[PDB]
Ligand binder design. Structure first.
Ligand SMILES: [Mg+2]
Ligand SMILES: [Mg+2]
Ligand SMILES: [Mg+2]
Ligand SMILES: [Mg+2]
Ligand SMILES: [Mg+2]
Ligand SMILES: [Mg+2]
Ligand SMILES: [Mg+2]
Ligand SMILES: [Mg+2]
Ligand SMILES: [Mg+2]
Ligand SMILES: [Mg+2]
Ligand SMILES: [Mg+2]
Ligand SMILES: [Mg+2]
Ligand SMILES: [Mg+2]
Ligand SMILES: [Mg+2]
Ligand SMILES: [Mg+2]
Ligand SMILES: [Mg+2]
Ligand SMILES: [Mg+2]
Ligand SMILES: [Mg+2]
Ligand SMILES: [Mg+2]
Ligand SMILES: [Mg+2]
Lengths: 150, 81, 129, 155, 144
RNA sequence: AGGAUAGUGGCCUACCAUGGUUUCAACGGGUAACGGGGAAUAAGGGUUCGAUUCCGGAGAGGGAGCCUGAGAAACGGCUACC
RNA sequence: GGUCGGAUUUCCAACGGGGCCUUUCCUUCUGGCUAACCUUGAGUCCUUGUGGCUCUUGGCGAACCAGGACUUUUACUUUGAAAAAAUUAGAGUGUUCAAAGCAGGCGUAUUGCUCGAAUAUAUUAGCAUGGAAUAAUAGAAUAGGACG
RNA sequence: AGGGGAUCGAAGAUGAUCAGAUACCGUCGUAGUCUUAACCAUAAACUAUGCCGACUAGGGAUCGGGUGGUGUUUUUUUAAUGACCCACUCGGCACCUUACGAGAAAUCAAAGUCUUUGGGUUCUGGGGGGAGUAUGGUCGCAAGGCUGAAACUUAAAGGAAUUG
């Protein structure tokens, strides 16, 4: 594993065997959907909405309690972002490293890490263009990449 | 051992194993109803929260995130499920 | 990464059989694996096997009768004509009388003798003896 | 092609031996010849009710379709009324019992009854030599959706 | 996967790898370079003719100790100079100088024989007559 | 679009457009390469060869050009040059 | 074994193909098929059987001809065909044998009779065909979806 | 090319040793050693062991994270937390035993699951020299690096182990 490292950690979630769950959840699907929508109004990404719903509330899996997954819900309600969440966070990291590099020219493993992050950005963006989420000829051009993530 | 029931292992052996490495993988985590020092409103808290979960009456804290299970805030009571 | 789930399954059975185990676990249990195991089962090379249903790809526990010498995969799945089945059996099988080369045909996954009497051909999956 | 400069060359463009009588004023002003190229290929309505000429068209021109029917992928629409398609195929090398990816580039005449974009899968039919390199006409296009319905600006 | 590619669609890679690695073989390299026609005393042929330039006494390699009785020959078709061993007890007397000689390789496809240093050809005929026939007295050299 | 051809075609011409091939090896270089049917050896897979009894192609010292003819750019036809 | 251990056959078994039913596409409208006749007016003249019937009660006229409100593409494999002759393998034939060759053989040699000159393989590409496992590909998501 | 230049110190000097000593040893000593801005791109750059995936044996120690003990320990006496103990678990640097198995052996839990030969994939080798030479190209200020033959020559070169 670890596309850009020699790590081999496994460390994931083990979601339950039950697809209908969990027999102590008395809340309604539409109630969870509206809580998802207002978190998306507050500018939370689907990962953050799912974390909040699991900790603060008893939402084990939004796709289980509701009918479908969180990014699908937000896209249904017009709350989809311009670029996917994971692509946004990779571009954000590349921008942060690049602004570290402009002030630290000797930081060569920062330069090495920036190459890894940008390689991860281009592979992801290539996927998203193939499944037609990003428009074709969408490109991370690395000079005005601060525009689309801030 | 050379002959053993791989379809029906002991519950002690399964409980010993990693969550991903049991016969059917599943979570070792749970959910808790937590009663705050102030009010008797039911709030459900994940075991391995990652959120500093707060309530309405004691709108500061119920659990503190850790590297694993969250720790309750020293003034609450809790029940599993 | 995992490239052939059938190669992994047949390796696990081989390494279990060679060490003397009566049982072996297999993950992740494709249906090609299931059909391959059924062809081995109908010829007595394994015993009864179980499909465990996790909600991802399943697992299999196979029971072993000690009569399997070697089960293997042929990768890549070479295209096999009717008239070059016998050269695969010559290359792979210890004797002409026993042992089976498993093929996948539009008529289904089967051994080479069932392929001969149905007069069908396809790709090679593996062998068993 | 009712518009966009059908008569854009030094000679008057017309279908040979098709006569528009200046006297008898039938309410179309244009006799347009057309044919069905055959082999179950439907004549496009664009050919029927158009006004382009294209003597190399298989529906309104003099050419005919006979011989090989091939499929390909449009890789270039840069020439005028000519596309290049890419025909990939697997070539079997017996010694290794394996194949290698191989491709051919076919230059194909395309009638203005057809709109083709780089990426469209096209059915082409053999005709007589049109050019130095061209021996096929487009008889069918297979651009239905283009997977471009979800690649636009979002509010 | 023990190295080499195994995909059903890797025929190009396997055939090119074989092409690249056949240059490591002596025979394939020599044949495809055309070295016998280009860089070889006989221009790739089995035998050649030449004129005896001079008789040589070649001291054999150790641990042997002998004079090996070769001749310097200039090949008619090339002009190249070669050294050819004259095989038998005597038979150097039969060779003389300015005589035409038919030379052959010796059997080591190049690669000078035995204890004779740098000699890779042997005289088979002299003046159109077999050395074997001259040595066994079956025939005589044409004086005129 | 025209010309030419037995006829299609940049085959050629005028005008116009900027195309066409290529790491799936284009372009170039080498070949002690005519191609194939085939041949030798070979458990199987392969390796090497095929100027040469049949099929196709090319040439008649090297080029080019042409006459007669249904048919030749013919060479036991012509013309010129080397 | 009624021909001095050799047909016959639901006694069947074992292989192999097809159709149908179980929620089950096998697209399609024009018209000649007139159902292994869905529905048995008239008739069960064979000493009893569930292996053999006649003009039929408008009778799903779906048992093939040439045109689509008609076509997801591809690899793979099956069969067929094509892959000149010679050659290769190989059938027949006492070239005295054999390499070969395609001959030859049998009479009533009195008026000629007759067997042959097979078959297979021939790789890839193209062509027709069955299959639908394997491996790709495509489909309804701002419904611009299908059914009608 | 600047800066710095304590130290040690290719060069050089010098004192020894010895037949010689332009070497080892002694005392100095430029470059260098350090830094900044550029080059270079090579090491026995080594685990002489490509990467990804699966499986095959036992054990204890250890680093990081986690989970569980009406387990010790200090702090108010013990709460907790820390630290420690025990038991598990994931990941990691390794180690030990054995030889299933492998190997020519040395040895190796991978160098195993290989003539019972096919999980995916990249690179490289084809007797010893000539030779990493010559030539061309390309990179470099240079030193040099990358790519890289042939003619010719040769019966061995080599690996691991055994006895002496
Ligand atoms: Mg990695
Ligand atoms: Mg990678
Ligand atoms: Mg893993
Ligand atoms: Mg490789
Ligand atoms: Mg023209
Ligand atoms: Mg030649
Ligand atoms: Mg030839
Ligand atoms: Mg020839
Ligand atoms: Mg010649
Ligand atoms: Mg000629
Ligand atoms: Mg001559
Ligand atoms: Mg002439
Ligand atoms: Mg003559
Ligand atoms: Mg002549
Ligand atoms: Mg004979
Ligand atoms: Mg190196
Ligand atoms: Mg190395
Ligand atoms: Mg470590
Ligand atoms: Mg060698
Ligand atoms: Mg060598």
């Amino acid at each position: 594993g670890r596309m850009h490292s020699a790590g081999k950690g496994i460390s994931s979630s083990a979601i339950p065997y039950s697809r209908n769950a969990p027999a102590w959840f008395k809340l309604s699907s539409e109630s969870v959907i509206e809580q998802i929508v207002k978190y998306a109004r507050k500018g939370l990404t689907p990962s953050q909405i799912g974390v909040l719903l699991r900790d603060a509330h008893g939402v084990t899996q939004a796709r289980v309690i509701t009918g479908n997954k969180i990014m699908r819900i937000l896209k249904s309600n017009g709350l989809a972002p311009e670029i996917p969440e994971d692509l946004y966070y990779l571009i954000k990291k590349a921008v942060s490293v690049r602004k570290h590099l402009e002030r630290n020219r000797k930081d060569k493993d920062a330069k090495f890490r920036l190459i890894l992050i940008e390689s991860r950005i281009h592979r992801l963006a290539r996927y998203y263009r193939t499944v037609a989420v990003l428009p074709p000829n969408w490109k991370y051009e690395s000079a005005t990449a601060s525009a689309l993530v801030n | 051992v050379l002959v053993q029931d791989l379809l029906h292992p002991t519950a002690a052996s399964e409980a010993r194993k990693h969550k991903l490495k049991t016969l059917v993988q599943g979570p070792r985590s749970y959910f808790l109803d937590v009663k705050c020092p102030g009010c008797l409103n039911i709030t459900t808290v994940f075991s391995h929260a990652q959120t500093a979960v707060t309530c309405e009456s004691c709108s500061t804290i119920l659990c503190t995130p850790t590297g694993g299970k969250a720790k309750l805030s020293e003034g609450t009571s809790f029940r599993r499920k | 990464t995992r490239s052939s789930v059938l190669a992994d399954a047949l390796n696990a059975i081989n390494n279990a059989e060679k060490t003397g185990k009566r049982q072996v676990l297999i993950r992740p249990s494709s249906k090609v694996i299931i059909k391959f195991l059924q062809v081995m089962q109908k010829h007595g090379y394994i015993g009864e096997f179980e499909y465990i249903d996790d909600h991802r790809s399943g697992k299999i526990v196979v029971q072993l009768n000690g009569r399997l010498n070697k089960c293997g995969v042929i990768s890549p799945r070479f295209n096999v004509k009717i008239g070059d089945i016998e050269k695969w059996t010559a290359n792979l099988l210890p004797a002409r009388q026993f042992g089976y080369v498993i093929l996948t045909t539009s008529a289904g996954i089967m051994d080479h003798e069932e392929a001969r009497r149905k007069h069908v051909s396809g790709k090679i999956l593996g062998f068993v003896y | 092609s009712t518009e966009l400069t059908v008569q854009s060359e030094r000679a008057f463009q017309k279908q040979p031996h098709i006569f528009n009588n200046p006297k008898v004023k039938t309410s179309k002003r244009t006799k347009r010849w057309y044919k069905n190229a055959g082999l179950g290929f439907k004549t496009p309505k664009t050919a029927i009710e158009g006004s382009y000429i294209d003597k190399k068209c298989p529906f309104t021109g003099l050419v005919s379709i006979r011989g090989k029917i091939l499929t390909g992928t449009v890789v270039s629409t840069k020439m005028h009324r000519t596309i290049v398609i890419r025909r990939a195929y697997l070539h079997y090398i017996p010694k290794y019992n394996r194949y290698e990816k191989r491709h051919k580039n076919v230059p194909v005449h395309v009638s203005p009854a057809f709109r083709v974009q780089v990426g469209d899968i096209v059915t082409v039919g053999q005709c007589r030599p049109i050019s130095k390199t061209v021996r096929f006409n487009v008889v069918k296009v297979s651009a239905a959706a283009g997977k471009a319905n979800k690649q636009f600006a979002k509010f | 996967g023990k190295g080499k590619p195994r995909g059903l669609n890797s025929a190009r890679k396997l055939r090119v790898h074989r092409r690249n690695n056949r240059w490591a073989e002596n025979n394939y390299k020599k044949r495809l370079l055309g070295t016998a026609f280009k860089s070889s005393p006989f221009g790739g042929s089995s035998h050649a003719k030449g004129i005896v330039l001079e008789k040589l006494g070649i001291e054999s390699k150790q641990p042997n100790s002998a004079i090996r009785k070769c001749v310097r020959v200039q090949l008619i078709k090339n002009g190249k100079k070669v050294t050819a061993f004259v095989p038998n007890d005597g038979c150097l007397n039969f060779v003389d100088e300015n005589d035409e000689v038919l030379l052959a390789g010796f059997g080591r496809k190049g690669k000078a024989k035995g204890d004779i240093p740098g000699v890779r050809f042997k005289v088979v005929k002299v003046s159109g007559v077999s050395l074997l026939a001259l040595w066994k007295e079956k025939k005589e050299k044409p004086r005129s």
